[PDB]
Predict the structure of Dihydroflavonol-4-reductase.
Amino acid sequence: LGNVVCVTGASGYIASWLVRLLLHRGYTVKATVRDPNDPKKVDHLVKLDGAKERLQLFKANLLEEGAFDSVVQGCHGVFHTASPFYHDVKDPQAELIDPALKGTLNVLNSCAKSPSLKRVVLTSSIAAVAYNGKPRTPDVVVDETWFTDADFCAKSNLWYVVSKTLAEEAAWKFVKENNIDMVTINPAMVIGPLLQPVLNTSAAAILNLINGAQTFPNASFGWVNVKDVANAHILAYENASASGRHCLVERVAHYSEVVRILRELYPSLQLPEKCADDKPYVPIYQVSKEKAKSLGLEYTPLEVSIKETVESLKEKKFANL
């Protein structure tokens, strides 16, 4: 409750929320960022309730070997969240795969030499679970027994999913051989309220639907509320019986369905009427909520997370409606 834990990539969306919630439960949080001295990118953290007294900032370059050695020491829990945001990709190997694997093992190495460590919570992705070749249609229930076939996805140049997949496999092989207790949280598209004026890929996609787009894409993604995965990380860490992977997806929805909800929430809002290609809609499917629910997690419904996202988009000045 009032113990010491470490959160990596603290400036990230999921991480920001995790820090806010950890601070609220009384924890002392040692957070790592690229430059804790840039009062521009750590402002949203220092402002959180309790931060002034229990937010401990440390400088750490995710790709710098040993950068996390001392910060994890003295922590019973380590939440490796660190999520490098978007950028045009040339070489997937040196730009996506290599940094993915490197940063994961960099932090795990640090945890391996920490006597205080009780459990590591790794933020993974639904990308490491659902892409094994099997069809994903309305009656299909994807769950934690599904594991992405990296080789298969590579043939389709689905390099981001490949990087997330290889990184998770690497993590499980490592913790197994180095006797570390690790659990992973696996979210899909993460939306909800904003703590700073910066958007992740998912919130920007929502922004794109309300700021005058002519069409909406023909795509179906799993969607989940940022408060829910942050809470899922805390519950998976605190509950001793928690283990393995945890799917964090509250329903898969096609963009036409997302647009329908937006029309219901905002009756006078201008929204795209046309889909991007005239082809049949990418089918939706189901994703198990059992494991997260087994820890007491309650899922926020999609119409509420969309409302919160659009409301924050206005508050942070991205949208003018």
User: Anything to note?
Assistant: The chain has one domain: 1-321. Residues 1-321 form a domain with the Rossmann fold fold (CATH 3.40.50.720).
